[PDB]
Design an enzyme around this catalytic site. Structure first.
Site, PDB file in Angstrom:
ATOM      1  N   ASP A   1      27.872  34.652  45.841  1.00  0.00           N
ATOM      2  CA  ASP A   1      28.378  34.423  44.503  1.00  0.00           C
ATOM      3  C   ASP A   1      27.445  34.988  43.449  1.00  0.00           C
TER       4      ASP A   1
ATOM      5  N   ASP B   1      30.490  33.670  52.055  1.00  0.00           N
ATOM      6  CA  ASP B   1      30.248  34.795  51.167  1.00  0.00           C
ATOM      7  C   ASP B   1      29.136  34.463  50.182  1.00  0.00           C
TER       8      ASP B   1
ATOM      9  N   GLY C   1      25.406  31.102  45.779  1.00  0.00           N
ATOM     10  CA  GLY C   1      24.968  31.822  44.597  1.00  0.00           C
ATOM     11  C   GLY C   1      25.436  31.137  43.337  1.00  0.00           C
TER      12      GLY C   1
ATOM     13  N   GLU D   1      26.641  36.874  40.281  1.00  0.00           N
ATOM     14  CA  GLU D   1      27.520  36.821  39.136  1.00  0.00           C
ATOM     15  C   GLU D   1      27.168  37.775  38.018  1.00  0.00           C
ATOM     16  N   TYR D   2      26.016  38.427  38.057  1.00  0.00           N
ATOM     17  CA  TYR D   2      25.541  39.191  36.908  1.00  0.00           C
ATOM     18  C   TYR D   2      24.785  40.430  37.339  1.00  0.00           C
TER      19      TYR D   2
ATOM     20  N   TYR E   1      39.371  32.670  34.495  1.00  0.00           N
ATOM     21  CA  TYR E   1      39.453  31.453  33.706  1.00  0.00           C
ATOM     22  C   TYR E   1      38.241  31.312  32.800  1.00  0.00           C
TER      23      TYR E   1
END
Lengths: 631, 499, 243, 70, 112
Positions: free
Chosen positions: A346, A344, A305, A348-349, A423
């Site tokens: 990813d 897994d 992802g 993100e939004y 980060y």
């Protein structure tokens, strides 16, 4: 395990039960032995390991990063005479170098000399360095089993692959590229508990790179009939570059033997299985073999992802059967590579963000929850419990969109883990002001911690308190690159927008190892700013950074001391787990520090290198919060 | 075992001609004390030297972090001294005592020490003896102190230099005319590791720490201690170099060993029981500290020799009559206390010898049930057991009818149990005869010891002789001890008038 | 008695059997093309051990059956079945010579352990007609010191062959000679010419050595058939198929 | 000289899988006390010695003589 | 001294015992494993260690353990097949046994 001894003596008549110890002035005490050294007439014991910058003076109820270098003032004036009492000091970098640190690269020096690069230590003649990771040293001490502590992990990516400087190159950034051999970690494996190869993808992705998706899909669709296998539509998962992943020998810890690097997307497909797996992925399996030869099996993992390949997440939403076909490709991958501890996703939004190509709606989050549940169900339907896989997703810490992620229902639907992106909070090229892109801790005046001063602890507390989720299911880590900003003024945090900023390869994203090369040092057993570049630290947020006046250039970055701060906090919390993003470009000292922050203990008196002196703070300062400055 | 020595201090051994402190202190501003010593010439001219003195302690700790230092515990404690010309510069004097006299040291603990009028006082527990030389010429160790080589001839057939070879196991066995395994077994270096009952916990338990790396029980603490100076660095097999090898030299020990083997050849039994015996006899008179044989030792030797030859008494029984008895065992071997008691296990809890803090008058606490179990192990009626209980409590000087945990009284009890049945005598027959003999009760409960003065009441040995012989005579008479006691009038009854 | 339940396991055999025929045959992603396998016994060979209903409450050793099955595998390869690496014949023979049986194999191991205890080369693998010549010396008459004279005469003529020989022919095998064997040929440097052949195997040295095992070259096997009138006086060997 | 070694000790025979990822090509061993029999030289020696102390099976008896026929 | 002093230098090999492979002959696993890799050096139509569905480096004490139970062990081997049959249609609930009673081809009789 490590072991050390000391001894004390008295007159034959007198036997103290306590460890008697020579009364003396403080001066650069260190180690594990008892010290009752005297300073400013006070008498001081660090009831903990001692470090050359640590000072008993401040230490009276301080002197270590956690607690008192406790004291009494039993000393009389004539004690203060028989011993010349100290009252102030400053530890310096030693003259010798107790350990080597790294080795030069012919090709990186050539790079700096390149008339386009024109790189210089000050970056004046060249803002970028593209420095080869090959400069790096192994840098891994060794450690005890320490089973109780939370798991350790690291991220890994294809950028390990190539630097045509190994191939001459000389004209373009990838010819001046980066990359390293996993042989590095192989030298002393079990360096982590888990690893995550970078987010791969699926057919139908939309972002810039999707031409790669096209190419690989083409190769697949060509092979499939010849293989006597069914064709695939969108949502089927992609390996991105099997030739890199397997058609390799350099950088992958294995002899050129059997490395049929000629093979590629149009031809790899039969080999697309762990048994057949040459190159990188096979090597990973072999490393796990060595690892088990020791014991303490790694959680081998990766995900899909992510920042640059998430685009199809919304598109795949609400296409239940294609989502099924996708997760089918997941379990097919599992069958092809049953070695894996887990893999897994990813996303993100849940609410739109990041790259605009990641088209998104509101319902996205709900649909994402639903399909997530469905994934769990499918997974459970495949796996045997003795070999079950349990899935995680990251989170962005976007105070609201993280809520929009509906973690509660995800937990209720068996998503076991979450990794908080900790980060790059400082979107340095576009951000309004300089700040610490990775601060865990809330600075004073939390009044503006909404798009700024984004202490991850806030989201942490939301999850724990405002969502009741046990820490077990959430994990945190650090990254091995700072931010760089032009013209910044430390008083205002105002800085030169848009102006180009330092990176070896990535402007605004200074690369840790090369920072060690250029700007920071430790050869003299200390945290040592160098080449005229300021080493510095803020009291408000326990922040740590670097600066240069000639270009008002600032760098926000994690440090051994600062990752120590992090890991120590995480440990006190007893988090679900600890990891490092972009692990590809730390020598491993930060990993050793991470062990320390985890309280993870070393297993021998010997060392690859020391670590204590890396925890002196930088130039102390107090920086006002963005709110504080604006108010 | 049991004894704390964490505050023990080294002591000037009452030296008439050497100076230094003899008492311990809780604290003093003194890095080192100092010691001053009479040097002596070969021609007996007199000289003096002085030295620094040192209580010393040492400790281990892992490097770690976020963990506090000095989580103190009792641990290693050691000694040394030093000399320097600043201490004394008189030098260059082969003619005035390059060789010189001995130096000698007590090892004592200073602690509350009085039965009731308590005050912190010192008592020794160990002795250390030394001889020291001014190597002015760097002369031969047998140019100096030259008698030992002659001795090594007349009872080692060989020179001091040859002694170097002895460290080799085969050289040892060869001069020994005896199989190395015998030595290895003497050293217990085999898989036959020592064992101890679960049912005892020794005080001062500086054992089991991650730094208590020593095995327990220790050999210099059990089984063969005499072969060492009750000293940590017990000799053992060590890794082969030029072949398998012996731990280390101690000519002092080597004589003690040679002696022991010689004896053993006349003692017939294995070494461990022999050690137990000789140790127990050493323990039977604290006056000695040299762990040496004595006339009383000899007496005990003949005593067992005769006793067991007559009536198959075991060394363990014999040594138990002399002193406390083993909770320890070799591998597979079984503890003596358990065999005496926890041999039977007819109860929820096997009585731990650490138990017994009780009072024997009433059957109430499970400790009373233990007293019952102990009496049954002793095959006695608990009521007569309670006849004995006050007697022994009185011998201990213990008060309030109380039972106390310690094996010592249990041992005195066991003696009292055993001694009569050794001759078929009832417990009370033993009491009667003991009284007939000593004109007193409870001497058999009294802890054995030795004394310079003629006191037949304390010469339990000849007491035993007289007891058994004269009881055999009573057997010849075919009469009960009680009847005889009445005849002697040592027992008395009234004569109240009546019809 | 356990005999009562001792039926269940046969039932379980049947269960597996049906799971094969019923499920595997249509669901075998393995073996999906290949069929046959109609009978239970089949996979006991094709992918299983000699796994048979025979039970008789006989005690049996995992070790032993695993071994036996290994033997199955070996033999299924020894005879040409499903393509296996049918190793060179001498290796195969060693298998049947020693690994055929524990004690067979065990004894082999014993020897391969022995530095020497009893190898006592009253005879040996090594040979040259030197050996029969030697024997002849041994067996003639009664033994005497002079006998070695005859042996050295043997040596004489043989070393005549050694010294002045047209060491000029042979063959180089594949590319493996960086590691292994090839062959060599030579001839008397005088008529009536005689010819011989020998070989050498480069495997007979340590991984890191350059010195080589004294096994070294094979002997100069004398050629049998008449050889003459060759145009140039030169001849060419080759070896294939172990001939 | 009858130089003797120690036992073919157990050390610890360890039950663990077999692979070069376990077994090692290096580019350790797995005993039981039985690799012996070599000692026969010593053994015969010792026996001879005991049959110096006496005689290799029993001790024999002498022979006699005759007159003039002699 | 004595003329021509005797010197049977049993030169120091530091003689130490050596393992028989017959004990633990199963180490034959080594040889055959190598030979398996040799078999693995063939056209991709051959199942090799996956022909060996049955076994793994079960390198454990078994001085004596004999029983006919290995029959049952072969059932546990069947465990593998049923596991893929689950991978054909999920189940984890001793269903291999339970379904043992349910279908064709065989009677699919009563299970344990």
């Amino acid at each position: 395990v490590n072991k050390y001894t000391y001894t004390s003596s008295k007159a034959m008549s007198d036997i103290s039960d306590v460890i008697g110890e020579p009364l003396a002035a403080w001066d650069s005490q260190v180690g594990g032995r008892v010290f009752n050294v005297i300073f400013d007439g006070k008498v001081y014991t660090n009831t903990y390991w001692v470090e050359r910058w640590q000072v008993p003076g401040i230490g009276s109820s301080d002197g270590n990063p956690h607690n008192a270098w406790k004291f009494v003032r039993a000393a009389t004036a004539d004690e203060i005479n028989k011993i010349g009492n100290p009252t102030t000091a400053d530890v310096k970098p030693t003259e010798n170098i107790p350990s080597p640190i790294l080795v030069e690269d012919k090709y990186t020096e050539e790079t700096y000399s390149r008339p386009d690069v024109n790189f210089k230590e000050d970056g004046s003649q060249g803002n970028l360095s593209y420095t080869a990771t090959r400069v790096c040293a192994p840098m891994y001490n060794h450690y005890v089993g320490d089973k109780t502590k939370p798991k350790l992990s690291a991220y890994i990516t294809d950028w390990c692959q190539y630097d045509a400087r190994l191939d001459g190159g000389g004209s373009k950034e990838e010819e001046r590229g980066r990359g390293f051999d996993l042989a590095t970690l192989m030298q002393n494996p079990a360096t982590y508990d888990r690893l995550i190869f970078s987010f791969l993808g699926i057919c139908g992705d939309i972002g810039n790179k999707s031409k790669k998706v096209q190419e690989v899909w083409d190769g697949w669709n060509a092979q499939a009939p010849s293989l006597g296998l069914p064709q695939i539509g969108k949502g089927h998962i992609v390996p991105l570059d099997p030739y890199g992943d397997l058609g390799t020998a350099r950088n992958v810890g294995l002899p050129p033997e059997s490395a049929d690097t000629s093979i590629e997307s149009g031809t790899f497909l039969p080999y697309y299985q762990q048994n057949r797996a040459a190159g990188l992925l096979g090597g990973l399996r072999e490393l796990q073999k060595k690892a088990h030869a020791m014991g303490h099996k790694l959680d081998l993992a990766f995900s899909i992802g992510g920042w640059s390949l998430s685009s199809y997440f919304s598109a795949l939403a609400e296409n239940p059967d294609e989502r099924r076909v996708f997760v089918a490709s997941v379990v097919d991958f599992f069958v092809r590579f049953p070695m894996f501890s887990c893999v897994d996703i990813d996303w993100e939004y849940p609410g739109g963000g990041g790259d605009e190509g990641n088209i998104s709606s509101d319902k996205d989050g709900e649909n994402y929850v639903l399909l997530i549940k469905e994934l769990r169900s499918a997974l459970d339907s495949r796996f045997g419990y003795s070999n079950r896989k349990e899935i995680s997703i990251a989170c962005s810490g976007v105070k609201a969109k993280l809520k929009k992620s509906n973690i509660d229902q995800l937990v209720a639907n068996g998503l076991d883990n979450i990794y908080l992106m900790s980060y790059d909070f400082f979107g340095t090229i576009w951000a309004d002001y300089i700040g610490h892109h990775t601060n865990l801790y809330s600075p004073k005046d939390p009044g503006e911690q909404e798009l700024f001063d984004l202490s991850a602890e806030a989201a942490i507390d939301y999850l724990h308190n405002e969502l009741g989720i046990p820490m077990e299911k959430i994990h945190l880590g650090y990254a091995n690159y700072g931010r760089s900003a032009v013209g910044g003024d430390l008083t205002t945090r105002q800085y030169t927008k848009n102006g180009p900023a330092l990176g070896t390869m990535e402007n605004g994203a200074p690369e840790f190892f090369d920072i060690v090369k250029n700007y920071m040092d430790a050869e003299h057993s200390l945290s040592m700013g160098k080449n005229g570049f300021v080493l510095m630290t803020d009291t408000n947020a326990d922040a740590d950074f670097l600066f240069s006046e000639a270009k008002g250039h600032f760098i926000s970055l994690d440090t051994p001391r600062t990752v120590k701060q992090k890991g120590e906090y995480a440990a006190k919390n007893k988090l679900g787990g600890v990891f490092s993003w972009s692990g590809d470009q730390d020598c491993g000292l930060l990993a050793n520090a991470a062990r320390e922050g985890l309280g993870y203990v070393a297993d021998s008196n010997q060392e690859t290198i020391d670590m204590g002196p890396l925890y002196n703070p930088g130039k102390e300062i107090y920086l006002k919060s963005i709110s504080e400055i604006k108010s | 075992a049991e004894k704390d020595l964490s505050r023990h201090g080294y002591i000037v051994k009452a030296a008439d001609n050497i100076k230094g402190p003899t008492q311990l202190v809780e604290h003093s501003d003194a890095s080192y004390d100092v010691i001053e010593l009479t040097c002596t010439n070969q021609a007996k001219e007199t000289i003096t030297v002085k030295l620094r003195g040192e209580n010393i302690i040492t400790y281990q700790r892992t490097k770690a972090r976020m963990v506090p230092f000095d989580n103190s515990s009792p641990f290693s404690r050691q000694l040394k001294l030093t000399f320097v010309a600043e201490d004394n510069p008189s030098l260059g004097n082969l003619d005035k005592g390059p060789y010189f006299a001995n130096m000698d040291i007590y090892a004592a603990e200073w602690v509350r020490e009085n039965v009731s009028s308590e005050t912190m006082v010192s008592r020794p527990f160990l002795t250390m003896t030394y001889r020291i030389a001014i190597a002015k010429a760097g002369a031969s160790l047998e140019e100096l102190q030259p008698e030992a080589d002659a001795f090594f001839i007349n009872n080692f057939g060989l020179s001091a230099e040859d002694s170097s070879q002895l460290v080799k196991l085969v050289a040892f066995g060869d001069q020994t005319g005896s199989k190395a395994e015998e030595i290895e077994s003497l050293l217990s270096c085999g898989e036959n590791l020592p064992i101890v009952s679960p049912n005892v916990i020794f005080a001062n338990p500086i054992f089991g720490s991650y730094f208590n790396d020593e095995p327990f029980p220790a050999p210099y603490h059990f089984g063969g201690v005499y072969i060492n100076a009750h000293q940590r660095n017990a000799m053992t097999i060590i890794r082969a170099e030029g072949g398998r090898e012996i731990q280390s030299l101690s000519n002092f020990r080597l004589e003690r060993l040679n002696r022991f083997i010689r004896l053993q050849r006349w003692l017939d039994l294995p070494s461990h029981q022999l050690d137990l015996l000789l140790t127990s006899v050493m323990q039977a008179d604290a006056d000695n500290s040299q762990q040496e044989i004595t006339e009383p030792v000899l007496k005990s030797l003949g005593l067992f020799r005769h006793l067991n030859l007559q009536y198959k008494i075991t060394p363990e029984i014999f040594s138990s009559w002399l002193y406390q008895l083993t909770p320890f065992a070799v591998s597979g071997e079984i503890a003596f206390f358990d065999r005496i008691f926890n041999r039977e296990q007819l109860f929820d809890q096997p009585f731990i010898l650490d138990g017994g803090s009780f009072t024997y008058l009433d059957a109430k606490g499970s400790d009373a049930k233990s007293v019952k179990q102990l009496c049954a192990g002793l095959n006695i009626s608990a009521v007569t057991f309670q006849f004995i209980a006050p007697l022994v409590q009185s011998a201990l000087g213990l008060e309030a009818g109380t039972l106390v945990r310690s094996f010592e009284v249990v041992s005195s009890l066991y003696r009292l149990v055993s001694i009569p049945q050794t001759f078929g005598l009832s417990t009370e027959d033993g009491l009667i005869l003991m009284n007939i003999l000593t004109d007193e009760m409870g001497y058999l409960a009294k802890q054995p010891a030795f004394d310079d003065k003629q006191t037949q009441d304390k010469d339990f040995l000849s007491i035993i002789l007289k007891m058994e012989a004269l009881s055999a005579w009573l057997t010849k008479n075919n009469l009960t001890p009680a009847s005889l006691a009445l005849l002697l009038g040592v027992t008395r009854l009234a004569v109240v008038p009546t019809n | 008695s356990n005999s009562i339940e001792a039926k269940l396991q046969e039932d379980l055999r049947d269960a597996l059997v049906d799971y094969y025929l019923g499920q595997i045959v249509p669901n075998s992603k393995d073996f999906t093309n290949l069929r046959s396998t109609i009978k239970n016994v089949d996979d006991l060979y094709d992918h299983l051990l000699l796994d048979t209903q025979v039970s008789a409450k006989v005690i049996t050793s995992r070790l032993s059956l695993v071994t036996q099955s290994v033997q199955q595998y070996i033999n299924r390869i020894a005879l040409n079945l499903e393509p296996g690496l049918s190793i060179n014949q001498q290796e195969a023979t060693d298998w049947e010579e020693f690994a055929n049986r524990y004690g067979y194999w065990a004894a082999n191991q014993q020897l391969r352990m022995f530095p020497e205890i009893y190898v006592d080369p009253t005879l040996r693998l090594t040979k040259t007609e030197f050996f029969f010549q030697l024997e002849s010396a041994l067996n003639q008459g009664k033994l005497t010191d002079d006998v070695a004279q005859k042996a050295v005469l043997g040596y004489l003529n043989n070393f005549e062959e050694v010294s002045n020989l047209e060491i000029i022919a042979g063959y180089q095998d594949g590319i493996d000679i960086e590691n292994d064997k090839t062959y060599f040929v030579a001839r008397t440097r005088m008529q009536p010419y005689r010819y011989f052949w020998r070989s050498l195997d480069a495997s007979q040295r340590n991984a890191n050595s350059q010195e080589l095992y004294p096994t070294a070259w094979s002997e100069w096997k004398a050629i049998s058939v008449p050889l003459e009138n060759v145009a140039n006086g030169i001849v060419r060997p080759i070896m294939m198929d172990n001939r | 000289l009858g130089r003797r070694p120690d036992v073919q000790l157990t050390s610890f025979w360890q039950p663990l899988t077999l692979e070069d990822a376990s077994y090692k090509t290096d580019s350790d061993i797995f005993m039981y006390p039985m690799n012996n029999e070599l000692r026969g030289l010593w053994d015969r020696i010792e026996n001879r010695i005991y049959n110096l102390r006496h005689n290799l099976t029993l001790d024999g008896k002498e022979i006699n003589m005759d007159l003039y026929d002699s | 001294l004595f003329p021509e002093p005797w010197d049977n230098f049993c030169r120091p090999g530091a003689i130490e015992a050596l393992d028989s492979p017959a004990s633990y002959l199963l180490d034959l696993y080594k040889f055959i494993q190598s030979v398996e890799l040799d078999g693995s050096n063939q056209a991709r139509k051959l199942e090799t260690r996956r022909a060996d569905i049955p076994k793994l480096s079960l390198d454990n004490d078994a001085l004596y353990k004999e029983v006919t139970a290995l029959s049952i062990v072969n059932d546990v081997l069947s465990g593998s097949a049923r596991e893929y049959i689950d991978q054909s249609g999920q189940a984890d609930k001793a269903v291999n046994q339970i379904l043992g009673d349910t279908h064709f081809p065989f009677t699919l009789p009563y299970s344990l």
